[PDB]
Amino acid sequence: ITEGEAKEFHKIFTSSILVFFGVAAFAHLLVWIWRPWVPGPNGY
Amino acid sequence: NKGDITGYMDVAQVVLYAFWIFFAGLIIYLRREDRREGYPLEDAISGKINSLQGLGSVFSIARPKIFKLKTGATYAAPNFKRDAVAIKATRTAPTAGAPFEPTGNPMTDAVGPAAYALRDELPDLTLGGQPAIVPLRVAPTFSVAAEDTDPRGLPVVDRKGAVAGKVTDLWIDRASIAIRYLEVELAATPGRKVLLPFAATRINAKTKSKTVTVQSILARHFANVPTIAKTDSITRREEDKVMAYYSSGYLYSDR
């Protein structure tokens, strides 16, 4: 694998990773509004 | 009183004792078959036929069986062909159980791990009658798998890092498909080629050369590897001699 190939893989790979993390964060936010998963002192 | 034969005997016990009799006979037969090579036993010192045996010696050794070979020859087992009593070694003690000490160079004298059996001076033959083990030059049809690394052209190195030579050919087996021997061109005395067993050689993986490491012997022992009469075929006796010489490295390499 050449240097330019590695750099291209890198930039579009982090470009695809940012979208993946954004989608995961949005889904987890929706799940949190649905039902939070961190119990309180007394519990749920 | 379901299975009772007598007051105490019953059918299960009778069948068990019948099996015991049969198993004793089977052990006798299996030992008979075990004694088809190397027997009768010889005296440790004199070499005359003498051993501590009982009344079962009549049944101990079976009549020689004949193996019919595709070449027309026959091999008898037991053949009663003993090795020479005198060997190039001397016992450390006069007792029968004492070990032997090599007189000179054990690797060349072929004693201990360097010893080999006096097999027939004939190469192994395939179904078609052609010699089984030939170099890749004589067998253009065969080829090494593309997923594997061709040992040809790879340096041959020993356990201490000394380079013994380079692989110039591979000796294959046509009967059972496998690589048997590696033809190595020695660095010292250029033009001299020695056979190298495949089973005693491991590839060193990621070395950027995949050096074919030989843990058996050192670099200086490659010059004394037994030679072969023909350049395209190897007899059984020469085969054994080469494997025996290589197998003795673990014991006589540092001596």
Partner: protein, 45 residues
């Protein structure tokens, strides 16, 4: 960018995708096992 110099980008992609899918499947099965987060046969909070 040198991570792709060490590792085959194709193999890295395949392994990362397989690992992510297996982890997602495991977490989903764990959530289904739990009573609170079982969204199919949902139970009251």
């Amino acid at each position: 960018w040198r991570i792709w110099q060490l590792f085959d980008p194709r193999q890295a992609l395949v392994g990362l995708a397989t690992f992510l899918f297996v982890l997602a499947l495991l977490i989903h099965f764990i959530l289904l096992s739990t009573e609170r987060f079982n969204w199919l046969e949902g139970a009251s909070t």
